[PDB]
């Protein structure tokens, strides 16, 4: 009851989006992952997959902002900065990409 997903339903939707991303359909993954984040915006696993889906869609500016939200949620994975660097390279921010890539190698 209610516009919400159980823990297993959230994982199922995350898996549906991850499969689309795996098979080179980032536009379809983004659709499923946006819905998961509309109902459960705190879903970190869903947001990381959306970040990569946006990178595959050449949407670097959006992908970098989603990484910023992960960072302030407490995300401490080193591969987060690899996404930030890749996102900055897509937008021409080569100096910001180098700064983020240094943090990826630091951790």
């Amino acid at each position: 009851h209610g516009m919400t997903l159980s823990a297993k339903q959230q994982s199922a939707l995350l898996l549906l989006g991850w499969l689309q991303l795996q098979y080179g359909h980032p536009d379809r993954a983004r659709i499923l992952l946006d819905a998961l984040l509309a109902l459960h915006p705190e879903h970190k696993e869903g947001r990381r997959a959306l970040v990569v889906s946006l990178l595959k869609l050449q949407k670097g500016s959006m992908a970098k902002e989603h990484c910023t939200l992960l960072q302030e949620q407490g995300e401490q994975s080193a591969a987060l900065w690899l996404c930030v660097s890749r996102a900055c390279q897509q937008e021409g921010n080569l100096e910001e990409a180098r700064s983020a890539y240094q943090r990826y190698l630091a951790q």
């Binding site: 339903q9 199922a12 991303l21 819905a35 990381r48 970040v51 990569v52 987060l80 690899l82």
Partner: protein, 66 residues
């Protein structure tokens, strides 16, 4: 193209749906919720997973192989 593997690994979640009985219950419960959403993001996703029903075999196979 070299970094594509590390990006996919970052997007891969670190299991609750291993049992096939639990998988079908999760899919039916997921389709019932998104079909009641009114926002364009929920409606677009409700259309998409209704077209992925023939892919449910590929879904469960990927779960067990991880």
């Amino acid at each position: 193209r070299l970094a594509d593997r590390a990006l996919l690994d970052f997007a891969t979640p670190h299991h609750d749906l291993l049992r096939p009985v639990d998988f079908h219950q999760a899919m039916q419960g997921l389709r019932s919720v998104l079909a009641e959403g009114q926002s364009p993001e929920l409606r677009a996703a409700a259309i998409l997973l209704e077209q992925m029903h023939a892919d449910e075999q590929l879904m469960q196979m990927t779960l067990h192989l991880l």
